Amino acid sequence: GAGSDAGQVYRGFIAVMKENFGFIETLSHDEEVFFHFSNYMGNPNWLELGQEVEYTLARNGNTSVSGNCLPAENVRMLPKNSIPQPAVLETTHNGVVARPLRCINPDQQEYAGLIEILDELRTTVISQHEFGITSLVNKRDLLQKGDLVSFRIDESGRAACVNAVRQK
Structure with a gap:
């Protein structure tokens, strides 16, 4: 328990919506995160640009899968107006x-x-x-x-x- 460890659910908002995958804008405007709808929890049909969501990063396996940038996991919706x-x-x-x-x-x-x-x-x-x-x-x-x-x-x-x- 230091804060530089694992066990942190990251909050962000949908910025790019494709039919296969999308990009989540970081809470702290760090960068855009590659997220696939294949690892999404809920109903993606009801998603829109600017919707608050919570998710974890898939750092499990290999840090340099294809090009360091790895997918998201366990993406769930959050209550609006929480940003x-x-x-x-x-x-x-x-x-x-x-x-x-x-x-x-x-x-x-x-x-x-x-x-x-x-x-x-x-x-x-x-x-x-x-x-x-x-x-x-x-x-x-x-x-x-x-x-x-x-x-x-x-x-x-x-x-x-x-x-x-x-x-x-």
Whole structure:
């Protein structure tokens, strides 16, 4: 019992839904986890993008199966609204949707994309903020390059509570 041992169920949310497998976005925005529906528990027909789920990682057998990245196991659904939100009263930063990260990932993570955040002088982009399926409240939208967004960064350490808002 140290915390660097085994016996930890990892929490995350569905970001990519294929009919065979999918990708779960990590709770702490570490990376995307390859998960197969073949090892899923429940009814996959009722799954959607942004659904909280609990699961363990299949580290049992060989750490470098085919390419180090191994599948998930025992994926179950979680209660909604259990993912915490950043503590910000009005808002932290605004910006415009810059570009979906397509060539940044060899395996195409472009779902996540990056927003260009304005500096304190409100002139240029500082670095890059990544947005999560959970943060994409307006995930229904065709939110694309050139759309203005307002969000709040705090404990999420990224663009969270992303609301597509158009200013007069």
